[PDB]
């Protein structure tokens, strides 16, 4: 009389400890392969008074190629995988499966654009821990890559029509979410640290910073952006500044596949039947979630 049944499981991409583990890990990889020559961080005490802390250590420049990694289950636990089409990232998943390790990942620290990640199978998908709350970040997962090549000549090249179609489809998916009669507009960052304002990323150890204004100025040939390689930056691992050594080889290049975006929607509390979206990012944890949203580690019971 016993009935056979599939095991339904509940996922929450916004509360996945795999994210914190990866975050801790990428930090460990960097602390052992991309150490700063000088590091300045805030050193405080109870009362609330702080003095700057400075650390000087060896900072050897090294050639850096992408090493594919993945997370596997320790004896005793299993990794669940949601296979649902257009899975939201939270709620129960009907067609789930198990894997020993997650798919191979080529992690990239960046902002505004997600580089070299996994693409969506069907159409574009957008996910947020809460679309109504405008303080929460919107992760856009593309289903079609948009290549972007950069040169040491401070400029990255991006296909304009390719990229304009992308904003078109991204915009279309936002409507399905915020309303089919609402007006979708893309505006540049509202400001903050240079890491937040520009599209910044690390390619082979070098820290690039590109003006992204041309990418987020849109209403519903190539696109060359002004880029810069910096030696002095603000850290993504902790609050503080770091200084790295200059580049080794004269010409520094970089080829990356744009696979997603980090957006925010302006809290347009005012009645207007229009929504504004700007480049987001900053917490590298959202970069980790965009790849781990379909997994959930659990105990074998």
């Amino acid at each position, epitope marked *: 009389e016993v009935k056979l049944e599939n095991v339904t499981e509940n996922f929450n991409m916004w509360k996945n400890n795999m994210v914190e583990q990866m975050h801790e890990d990428i930090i460990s990889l960097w602390d052992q392969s991309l150490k700063p020559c000088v590091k300045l961080t805030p050193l405080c005490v109870g009362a609330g008074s702080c003095n700057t802390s400075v650390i000087t250590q*060896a900072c050897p420049k090294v050639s850096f190629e992408p090493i594919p990694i993945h997370y596997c289950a320790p004896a005793g636990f299993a990794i669940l995988k949601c296979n649902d089409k257009k899975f939201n990232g939270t709620g129960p998943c009907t067609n789930v499966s198990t894997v020993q390790c997650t798919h191979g990942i080529r992690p990239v620290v960046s902002t505004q654009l997600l580089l070299n990640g996994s693409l969506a199978e069907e159409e574009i998908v957008i996910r947020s821990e809460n679309f109504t709350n405008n303080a929460k970040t919107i992760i856009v997962q593309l289903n079609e890559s948009v290549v972007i090549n950069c040169t040491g000549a401070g400029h990255c090249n991006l296909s304009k029509t390719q990229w304009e179609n992308t904003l078109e489809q991204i915009a279309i998916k936002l409507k399905e979410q915020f309303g089919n009669n609402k007006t979708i507009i893309f505006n540049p960052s509202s400001g903050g640290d240079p890491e937040i304002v520009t599209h910044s990323f690390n390619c082979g150890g070098e820290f690039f910073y590109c003006n992204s204004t041309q990418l987020f100025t849109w209403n519903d040939r190539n696109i060359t952006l002004p880029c810069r390689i910096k030696q002095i930056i603000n850290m993504w691992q902790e609050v503080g500044k770091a200084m790295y050594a*200059p580049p080794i080889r004269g010409q520094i290049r970089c080829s990356s596949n744009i696979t997603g975006l980090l957006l925010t929607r302006d809290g347009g509390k005012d009645t207007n039947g229009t929504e504004i979206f700007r480049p987001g990012g900053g917490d590298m944890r959202d970069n980790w979630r965009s790849e781990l949203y379909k997994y959930k580690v659990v105990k074998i019971e």
Partner: antibody
Amino acid sequence: VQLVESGAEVKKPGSSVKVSCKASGDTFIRYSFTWVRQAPGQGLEWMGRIITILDVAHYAPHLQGRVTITADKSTSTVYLELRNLRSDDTAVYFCAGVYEGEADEGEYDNNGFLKHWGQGTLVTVSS
Amino acid sequence: DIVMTQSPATLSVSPGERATLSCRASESVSSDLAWYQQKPGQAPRLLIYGASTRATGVPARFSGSGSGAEFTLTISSLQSEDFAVYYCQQYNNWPPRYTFGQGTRLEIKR
């Protein structure tokens, strides 16, 4: 790009001296500055260097926290402080600096050589 | 502690002739090697840096050469203004603990 230092000094043992180096001619924060000493009849001695834009100074070990290198972005002036002076601290102190690039835009060469030099300041320590 | 050794301590050479100064590092320093000239009662002057790159305003008779832990400074035609003391300096280590050579005094042969 000019570097000018304050006049000679005669100090009493155990006292402190603070030499200054007024830089001018270009963007102060785009240079790093070094202090070099040379005792009478002796060679050059590297004392330390400050990464101005970052406001961080590094020093030569055997100085045991008696020296402090500081900069004042407001007046484009670098300073060398030496404490609890001893007779053998008597020497000419040289101030120097080099262009590092667009530090203010985040670029930095971290060049360790010395292109521009002050005139030197004589410091005599004796009772 | 990276030690820089210069040889010989004193070099005598006739004017108009060629001089060649030696500098050795106790260990590798790559190319972060500079050369300075200093006349008595004056501040040092930068001549070469990056082992072979010659600073601006420095005669072409002055040429730098070397790599690793062995460097050389060459002056093809000694002029009166070239007779002084020369120092080499390394700035390759980090944390920075830069150091100078003891010096090589260039004097006139008569």
